[PDB]
Amino acid sequence: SGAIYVGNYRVVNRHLATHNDWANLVWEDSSRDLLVSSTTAQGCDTIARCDCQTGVYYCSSRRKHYPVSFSKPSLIFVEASEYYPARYQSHLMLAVGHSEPGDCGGILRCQHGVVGIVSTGGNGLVGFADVRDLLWLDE
Numbered sequence: 001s002g003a004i005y006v007g008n009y010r011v012v013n014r015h016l017a018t019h020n021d022w023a024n025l026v027w028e029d030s031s032r033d034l035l036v037s038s039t040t041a042q043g044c045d046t047i048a049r050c051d052c053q054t055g056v057y058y059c060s061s062r063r064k065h066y067p068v069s070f071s072k073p074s075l076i077f078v079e080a081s082e083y084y085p086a087r088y089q090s091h092l093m094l095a096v097g098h099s100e101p102g103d104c105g106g107i108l109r110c111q112h113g114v115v116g117i118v119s120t121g122g123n124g125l126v127g128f129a130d131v132r133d134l135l136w137l138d139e
């Protein structure tokens, strides 16, 4: 679990969005596993606007942060799950690092701010949904 709170927006994994997220929907994209909902309170986070390929992510299944080298956002095949049919997920960045299903929502940060959230993983990989291209989150 986890979310990014920026301005009057909440960014979550689309597959973990709540009834309240859907009732306050701003934007969603199944191909990216992202959903953004509106909030009444001002957020605590800021978004990176950069091309970093290193950063640190929070891993809830270890209660720890780990450093990672990750690929640029790309279109990657993701096998069928209870949440989606087999498909290509876009804007996904892969890295070597521990992750388990409940780690989705963990934030990846670089020195410039929030880069993205854990969305996929397994077998010593961790995949992050990028948010750096969503310029409207800032205004």
Ligand SMILES: Cc1cccc(CC(=O)N2CCC[C@H](C(N)=O)C2)c1
Binding pocket: 015, 033, 078, 081, 082, 083, 084, 089, 099, 100, 101, 102, 103, 104, 118, 119, 120, 121, 122, 126, 127
């Ligand atoms: C973080 C992690 C580690 C091991 C396993 C998993 C599960 C996983 O990859 N799924 C299920 C949920 C939706 C995901 C998606 N973005 O399509 C795919 C997730």
Ligand SMILES: [Zn+2]
Binding pocket: 048, 049, 050, 051, 052, 110, 111, 112, 113
């Ligand atoms: Zn950066």
